Design an enzyme around this catalytic site. Structure first.
Site, mmCIF file in Angstrom:
data_model
loop_
_atom_site.group_PDB
_atom_site.id
_atom_site.type_symbol
_atom_site.label_atom_id
_atom_site.label_comp_id
_atom_site.label_asym_id
_atom_site.label_seq_id
_atom_site.Cartn_x
_atom_site.Cartn_y
_atom_site.Cartn_z
ATOM 1 N N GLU A 104 0.528 -0.738 0.144
ATOM 2 C CA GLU A 104 0.165 0.133 0.305
ATOM 3 C C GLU A 104 0.541 0.841 0.019
ATOM 4 O O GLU A 104 0.643 1.906 -0.711
ATOM 5 C CB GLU A 104 -1.129 0.028 1.422
ATOM 6 C CG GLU A 104 -1.926 -1.021 0.947
ATOM 7 C CD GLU A 104 -2.800 -1.259 2.131
ATOM 8 O OE1 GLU A 104 -1.877 -2.440 3.646
ATOM 9 O OE2 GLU A 104 -4.311 -1.025 2.653
ATOM 10 N N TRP A 168 0.164 -7.119 6.869
ATOM 11 C CA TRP A 168 -1.506 -7.692 7.280
ATOM 12 C C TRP A 168 -2.192 -6.887 6.117
ATOM 13 O O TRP A 168 -2.675 -5.997 5.858
ATOM 14 C CB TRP A 168 -1.604 -6.954 8.243
ATOM 15 C CG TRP A 168 -3.327 -7.006 8.883
ATOM 16 C CD1 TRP A 168 -4.026 -7.666 8.471
ATOM 17 C CD2 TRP A 168 -3.902 -6.812 10.114
ATOM 18 N NE1 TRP A 168 -4.964 -7.407 8.728
ATOM 19 C CE2 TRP A 168 -5.196 -7.199 9.911
ATOM 20 C CE3 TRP A 168 -2.901 -6.373 11.429
ATOM 21 C CZ2 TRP A 168 -5.884 -6.929 11.249
ATOM 22 C CZ3 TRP A 168 -3.818 -6.184 12.739
ATOM 23 C CH2 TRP A 168 -5.400 -6.321 12.813
ATOM 24 N N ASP A 170 -5.338 -4.931 3.141
ATOM 25 C CA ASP A 170 -6.084 -4.410 4.111
ATOM 26 C C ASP A 170 -7.421 -5.251 3.593
ATOM 27 O O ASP A 170 -7.455 -6.237 3.154
ATOM 28 C CB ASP A 170 -6.402 -2.810 2.850
ATOM 29 C CG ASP A 170 -7.790 -1.861 3.248
ATOM 30 O OD1 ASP A 170 -8.144 -2.270 4.915
ATOM 31 O OD2 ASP A 170 -7.679 -1.192 2.203
ATOM 32 N N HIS A 216 -3.234 2.821 13.499
ATOM 33 C CA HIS A 216 -3.539 3.589 12.370
ATOM 34 C C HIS A 216 -2.894 2.654 10.987
ATOM 35 O O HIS A 216 -2.652 1.597 10.965
ATOM 36 C CB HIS A 216 -3.214 5.001 12.139
ATOM 37 C CG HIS A 216 -2.832 5.536 11.107
ATOM 38 N ND1 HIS A 216 -2.095 5.213 10.000
ATOM 39 C CD2 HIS A 216 -1.370 5.978 11.507
ATOM 40 C CE1 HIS A 216 -0.821 5.173 9.496
ATOM 41 N NE2 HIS A 216 -0.306 6.085 10.604
ATOM 42 N N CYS A 217 -3.726 3.298 9.157
ATOM 43 C CA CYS A 217 -2.879 2.479 8.516
ATOM 44 C C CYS A 217 -3.521 3.028 7.503
ATOM 45 O O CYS A 217 -3.123 4.322 7.076
ATOM 46 C CB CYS A 217 -3.303 0.701 8.473
ATOM 47 S SG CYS A 217 -4.236 0.743 9.584
ATOM 48 N N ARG A 223 -8.306 -2.732 10.543
ATOM 49 C CA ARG A 223 -7.245 -3.735 11.331
ATOM 50 C C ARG A 223 -6.862 -2.995 12.425
ATOM 51 O O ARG A 223 -6.585 -3.518 13.526
ATOM 52 C CB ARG A 223 -5.954 -3.637 10.272
ATOM 53 C CG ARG A 223 -5.832 -3.661 9.154
ATOM 54 C CD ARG A 223 -4.976 -4.031 7.899
ATOM 55 N NE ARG A 223 -5.187 -2.708 6.888
ATOM 56 C CZ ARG A 223 -5.069 -2.230 5.887
ATOM 57 N NH1 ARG A 223 -3.415 -3.016 5.581
ATOM 58 N NH2 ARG A 223 -4.753 -0.709 5.587
ATOM 59 N N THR A 224 -6.810 -1.163 12.580
ATOM 60 C CA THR A 224 -6.400 -0.639 13.638
ATOM 61 C C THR A 224 -7.521 -0.726 14.792
ATOM 62 O O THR A 224 -7.369 -0.651 15.238
ATOM 63 C CB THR A 224 -7.653 0.523 13.110
ATOM 64 O OG1 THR A 224 -6.137 1.322 11.950
ATOM 65 C CG2 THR A 224 -6.916 2.217 14.007
#
Ligand SMILES: */C=C/S(=O)(=O)Oc1ccccc1
EC number: 3.1.3.48
Length: 282
Positions: A104, A168, A170, A216-217, A223-224
């Site tokens: 990403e 990981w 999304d 976050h991400c 995931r957060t």
């Protein structure tokens, strides 16, 4: 059974009605509105709760699930980097967990600045990135760690521990085992950095709005959400806190999308079941 299918279905129903209610209307009062032209929300549909907004020009939120206090946000946009680093510095961030994949970040089409893996200069703030350890969390999931050093003329120099989970994907949920190992690492890292601040009589120790783990991400709702959910269950102070409560709280405190996927909700459900923690409120 409290974790049987009837119970799960009922949980989803309540959470789903909640998601729909929280959906952002145009110029919604409950959500932070873009200052005036420059994009605020990375995803127009994924907004930031106004009453818990950390900064006027960021899609970020203070979140308290039970007694657990953190900060959930989207991946800072290019133009928000300076403001983003200020939040990090002022919050004396004990740990910054980034669950956005390397793929990403690399995809320039996504506008996700590689702000923590390399040094950079944003505004009057200069950031120094340094690599540290790397920890496997199981199932081939890897935790890459860094130390972000926020420098800014006239301001106090702040170093931030970073836990980056680069693989990981999304909209997916890693095993309950991995999630558990991850929370342990993040809680651990936050604990060590906080101890340093405590050991130096830092005033940020008494302030509840500071020293909060920043997770976050990309959007900061999947995931957060899962990690934050696993982190509160890791705190003994949250006995009896239901899964319904946890998600109900994350949603009201950021947006109705918190805990985006069903498999991500299942992981918290699996973890809660492992603790004999209730799913629904009576
Ligand atoms: C932090 C990213 S996320 O929590 O996994 O949420 C998300 C990201 C991108 C699209 C949809 C959800």
């Amino acid at each position: 059974s409290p974790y049987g299918p009837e119970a799960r279905a009922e949980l989803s129903s309540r959470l789903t009605t909640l998601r729909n209610t929280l959906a952002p209307a145009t110029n919604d009062p409950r959500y932070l509105q873009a200052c005036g032209g420059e994009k605020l929300n990375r995803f127009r549909d994924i907004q930031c709760r106004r009453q818990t907004a950390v900064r006027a020009d960021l899609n970020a939120n203070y979140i308290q699930v039970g007694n657990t206090r953190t900060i959930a946000c989207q991946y800072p946009l290019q133009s928000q980097l300076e403001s983003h680093f200020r939040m990090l510095a002022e919050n004396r961030t004990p740990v910054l967990a980034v669950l956005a994949s390397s793929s990403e970040i690399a995809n320039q089409r996504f506008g996700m600045p590689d702000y923590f893996r390399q040094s950079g200069t944003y505004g009057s703030i200069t950031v120094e990135s340094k690599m540290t350890q790397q920890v496997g969390l199981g199932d081939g999931i890897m935790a890459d760690m860094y130390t972000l050093t926020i420098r800014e003329a006239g301001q106090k120099t702040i170093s931030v521990p970073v836990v980056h989970v680069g693989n990981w994907p999304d909209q997916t949920a890693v095993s309950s085992e991995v999630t558990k190992a991850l929370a342990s690492l993040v809680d651990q890292t936050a604990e060590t950095k906080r101890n340093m601040y405590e050991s130096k009589g830092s005033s940020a120790v008494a302030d509840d709005s500071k020293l909060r783990p920043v997770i976050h991400c990309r959007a900061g709702v999947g995931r957060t959400a899962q990690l934050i959910g696993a982190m509160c269950m890791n705190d003994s102070r949250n006995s009896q806190l239901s899964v319904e409560d946890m998600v109900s709280q994350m949603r009201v405190q950021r947006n109705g999308i918190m805990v985006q996927k069903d498999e991500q909700l299942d992981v918290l459900i699996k973890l809660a079941e492992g603790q004999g923690r209730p799913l629904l409120n009576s």
